[PDB]
């Protein structure tokens, strides 16, 4: 399968808005798609168990009918760093289970989108971060950036560190997280100049659904 | 003089709160101190000209009596990236003027604190960022980090990039930007483990004055 990891520049960048847009565009191109969010914290209780809304969104946006645990093996209720709640709950986040879950999706889907659990350096244990797993899996990375002043610095930081890990920065998605503002065009220009990867599309400001149309999948 | 550059991990980390704390502690140690913020945007009009509140705070916290323009040579009214407003106003931000202003402070002060104008990668022109000047001046860097979940990733990103530039990360300051929360201790632990530089002190949550006491200057 084609595989991509999605990471945001900051917490408020609408990363899963961009992930649903990406999955929608892949489906429209005729790919059997699957979303995969191995680790999720910040979950609601239900009769079936803990469901995190970002993984629910990946699940409903996959072209394949997938069970929840297939999309999200590790679900934690408190919205904090995975290494904290994993250690509090007594449930190790295992690299081999994260990798097995991706393989299981590859025998069914030919276009898989993987979403992390926070920024690039999200700790999963005291000695293992999400970045170590992505590097191990050699996943191409797609950056999601909110069109805002602070994200010029955040996008550049993240981009430099990914490239330093010897990973491929496959592209970036601009997400308009506020109503139209005064320096929107100049911010888009600065970001296009500085991020060494193709801009895949820009998602307009919506209060926060069919967003596949904003993504040019031919650039990936 | 001893010289230090201060940078924050994100916009809301209270960077000048930490800069006033640092200057206060340096004054209490018997140093002739000077704050220096070469580039500032987001300024108020007065009879004397544009004054930015962060540079005003550096000025009042310096042990030396300094004129405003000595603390802040480049003042722009709109709060946007310096390269945008410099190009709009027709006033180039000159590396040699930024460096001359630091030298002028070194002939009067023996402990100088330099504050940037946004995050690490703040563009000053289309080909020159604040990071290029700091690298050129070979300034030791002090990181200011808000004790919040997103800043674990931001601090690690910034730290990696500074070290990659071959600069010294002199230390970091924890700033408590919210009321006491549930995972405050675990966040402080994770940040102390991951940032490869001494923690210089932690500034408690105040609505936002004598804060020199929270800084251990002996670690610098």
Swiss-Prot record, chains A, B:
Descriptive protein name: ATP-dependent dethiobiotin synthetase BioD 1
Protein species of origin: Escherichia coli (strain K12)
Chain sites annotated for binding Mg(2+) 2: 16, 54, 115
Role according to the record: Catalyzes a mechanistically unusual reaction, the ATP-dependent insertion of CO2 between the N7 and N8 nitrogen atoms of 7,8-diaminopelargonic acid (DAPA, also called 7,8-diammoniononanoate) to form a ureido ring. Only CTP can partially replace ATP while diaminobiotin is only 37% as effective as 7,8-diaminopelargonic acid. In another study both CTP and GTP (but not ITP, TTP or UTP) can partially replace ATP.
Required co-factors: Mg(2+)
Active site (catalytic residues): 37
Complex formation: Homodimer.
Similarity annotation: Belongs to the dethiobiotin synthetase family.
Alphabetized UniProt keyword annotations: ATP-binding, Biotin biosynthesis, Cytoplasm, Ligase, Magnesium, Metal-binding, Nucleotide-binding
